[PDB]
């Protein structure tokens, strides 16, 4: 859980796993003989399956059932298991695995696992289920393809439904707080596209990559805003225009000189920075924005260390202006 993050690597972690039927069978048989009720060993594996490895729950079940039924055998195991089944909410990986299984979308499967059950499965975690589905709906081998329908066409239909679900989600989290739309979202974001591409997972199930990408975009936008308001006094544009238009020319007038004149260009670069109130951190951030062929990481690492050291020394050996006086 997120709340456990502070305990990352401070304590010796010891994991206790669900004990199997064999490790406990003697205990339950001893309890049965002491308590004077008949228990068939062949059903113990079932009983644990009912309790999901909860020994305390197993003992409670035995105590409650023995009050009226003194013999536990195959003639009554099914009803006891169904009545005492532990219904725990699934986790995002399990939710994704279940929702994308084709069997539940067949006539018999849909009759056994109903649409209401699928909506409830979504509601096990309504925040993460749509992200899981959008992450893993292209990684399946479908078994629900309609005649004459390619995998690509079903993927396109699912993507359209996911876009509609995103619109509904925006509606829910607006100022009107239309939480009553949550069930509809469940259908549009998760159930419908899954029914369109349900089948067998082709590879491993992956956790949603949208959250990390969103955080990275937020960080880059913050850096871009800082750069923009450092250079506001000199430029005429918005931050988007700064990213799309100014930044390549700033790359040519800030990074290229080091790769051509070595240390002799340091002054010029600093001059440009002083003309736009840019700092060393702004320089690095600017170099961090470029994509595609203009990636700078390898180029920057290839620069001689002496040139960078001299650049830092020269920048620290002078006085610089301030665009924003706090």
């Amino acid at each position: 859980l997120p709340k456990m993050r502070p305990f990352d690597r401070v304590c010796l972690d010891i994991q206790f796993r669900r004990p199997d039927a064999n490790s406990i069978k003697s205990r339950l048989m001893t309890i049965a003989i002491r308590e004077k009720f008949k228990l068939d060993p062949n059903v113990i594996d079932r009983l644990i399956q009912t309790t999901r490895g909860d020994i305390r729950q197993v003992i409670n079940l035995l105590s409650t059932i023995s009050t009226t039924t003194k013999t536990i055998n195959h003639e009554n195991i099914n009803e006891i298991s169904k009545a005492w089944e532990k219904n725990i909410a699934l986790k995002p990986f399990d939710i994704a695995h279940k929702m994308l299984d084709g069997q539940i979308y067949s006539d018999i499967g849909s009759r056994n696992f109903t649409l209401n059950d699928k909506i409830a499965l979504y509601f096990d975690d309504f925040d993460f289920t749509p992200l899981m589905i959008q992450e893993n709906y292209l990684s399946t081998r479908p078994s629900v393809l309609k005649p004459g329908q390619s995998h690509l066409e079903a993927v396109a239909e699912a993507a359209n439904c996911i876009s509609l679900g995103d619109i509904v989600e925006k509606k829910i989290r607006s100022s009107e707080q239309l939480w009553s739309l949550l069930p509809l979202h469940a259908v549009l974001s998760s159930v419908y596209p899954a029914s369109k591409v349900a089948g067998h997972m082709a590879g491993r199930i992956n956790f949603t990559a949208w959250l990390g990408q969103n955080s990275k975009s937020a960080k880059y936008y913050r850096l871009l805003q800082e750069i923009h308001y450092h250079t506001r006094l000199g430029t005429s544009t918005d931050k988007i225009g700064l990213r799309l238009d100014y930044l390549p020319t700033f790359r040519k007038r800030l990074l290229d000189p080091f790769l051509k004149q070595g240390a002799d260009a340091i002054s010029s670069v600093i001059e440009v920075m002083d003309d736009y109130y840019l700092t060393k951190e702004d320089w690095d951030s600017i170099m961090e924005f470029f994509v595609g062929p203009d990636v700078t990481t390898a180029i920057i690492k290839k620069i001689p260390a002496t040139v960078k050291s001299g650049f830092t020394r020269k920048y620290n050996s002078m006085t610089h202006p301030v665009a924003i006086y706090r």
């Binding site: 959008q134 292209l138 990684s139 390619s150 995998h151 690509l152 066409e153 993927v155 396109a156 993507a159 359209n160 996911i162 876009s163 995103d166 619109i167 989600e169 925006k170 989290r173 990559a209 949208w210 990408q213 975009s217 880059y220 936008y221 871009l224 805003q225 308001y229 506001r232 006094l233 000199g234 430029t235 005429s236 544009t237 918005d238 931050k239 988007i240 225009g241 990213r243 799309l244 238009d245 100014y246 390549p248 020319t249 700033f250 040519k252 007038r253 290229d256 001059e271 003309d275 736009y276 924005f289 470029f290 994509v291 595609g292 062929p293 203009d294 665009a323 924003i324 006086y325 706090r326």
Partner: protein
């Protein structure tokens, strides 16, 4: 030093170099500025809208409008969050970009702007008429990025406090501006400069910078490649000059930005491969683009027009592509997560082509 796009930016109405009719209209507006209504300047990006706004302010108040200072204002949400807004100010005007706080832009309109609106002018700012100015000008950049709530908040503030402030909004498109706000403003169309005007401006920059040119056709090529974006044209001229040792030849290639090259590569990949795995790699490319501050609407427009320029596609494919682009642009307007809609558009295009 200072980039040529900034060093040679005009600082007065008489220094403007294109769209003479618009210059005359602005001069007519500045002739009797006391009863100036609220203004809304709309037109293609990078044409000179902000330059003309600053020139109009200079004509009204004087050169002091260019003495800009940056300050930071503090705001508190209902959840106790602390937000900071950068305000550019001069002795005569204020400038704000409320979209900087996203959904909290409304607060800026409801607290800061109103506070400015409820203040009368007592400083003796003597004007050409002989009397002191009675209102301060507030510029709202990217006015079309405001949420509907902030626009609604602007409405009565514009009318009640007209004697104290005058608003100048600047946008690249009026589609996202609500009807009441457009009704409350004087709309000014700012057309892009022609190719010849761009060539003249670039030639003046070249002569003032002592750059060798094999001919005047390179400037025309840059103007055509800019598609009417003067800022882009000037930046591209500077980039080419830097890349060719301050000497441009007739064979000097036109430079393109990183994101444009990436989007063109994505278009080629989409055209050549139409498969689910291709869609996965396209998702990776889209994530890379979005992460580095490329707006989703820009990506959609660029990809659509790149696809429409592919010579191997037929009329039916292009019609389907433009229809899907329309639908998914609407989806982007009403959605939260842009990647969902971009992926949907790419999947539909792949289906239509295949």
């Amino acid at each position: 030093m200072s980039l040529w796009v900034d060093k040679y930016r005009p600082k007065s109405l008489n220094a403007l170099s294109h769209n003479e009719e618009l210059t005359n209209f602005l001069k007519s507006l500045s002739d009797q500025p006391r009863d100036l209504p609220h203004l809304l300047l709309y037109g293609p990006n990078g044409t000179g809208k902000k330059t003309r706004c600053m020139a109009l302010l200079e004509s009204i108040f004087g050169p002091g409008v260019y003495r800009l200072k940056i300050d930071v204002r503090q705001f508190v949400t209902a959840s106790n969050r602390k937000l900071e807004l950068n305000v550019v100010s001069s002795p005569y005007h204020l400038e704000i970009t409320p979209s900087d706080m996203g959904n909290n832009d409304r607060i800026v309109i409801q607290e800061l702007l109103k506070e400015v609106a409820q203040m009368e002018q007592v400083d003796f700012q003597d004007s050409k008429d002989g009397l002191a100015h009675r209102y301060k000008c507030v510029i709202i950049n990217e006015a079309n990025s405001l949420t509907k709530d902030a626009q609604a908040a602007l409405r009565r503030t514009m009318e009640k406090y007209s004697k104290n402030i005058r608003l100048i909004m600047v946008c690249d498109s009026m589609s996202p501006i609500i009807a009441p706000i457009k009704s409350r403003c004087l709309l000014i169309r700012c057309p892009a400069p022609s190719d010849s005007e761009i060539s003249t401006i670039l030639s003046d920059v070249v002569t003032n910078e002592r750059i060798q040119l094999e001919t005047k056709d390179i400037l025309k090529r840059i103007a055509q490649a800019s598609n009417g974006n003067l800022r882009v044209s000037l930046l591209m001229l500077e980039s080419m000059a830097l890349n060719n040792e301050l000497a441009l030849k007739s064979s000097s290639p036109i430079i393109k930005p990183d994101w444009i090259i990436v989007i063109h590569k994505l278009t080629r990949k989409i055209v050549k491969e139409r498969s689910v795995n291709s869609l996965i790699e396209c998702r990776a490319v889209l994530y890379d683009l979005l992460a580095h501050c490329i707006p989703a609407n820009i990506i959609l427009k660029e990809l659509t027009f790149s696809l429409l320029d592919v010579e191997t596609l037929n009329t039916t494919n292009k019609s389907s592509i433009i229809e899907y682009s329309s639908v998914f642009d609407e989806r982007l307007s009403l959605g939260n997560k842009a990647i969902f809609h971009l992926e949907g558009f790419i999947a539909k295009v792949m289906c239509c082509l295949d």
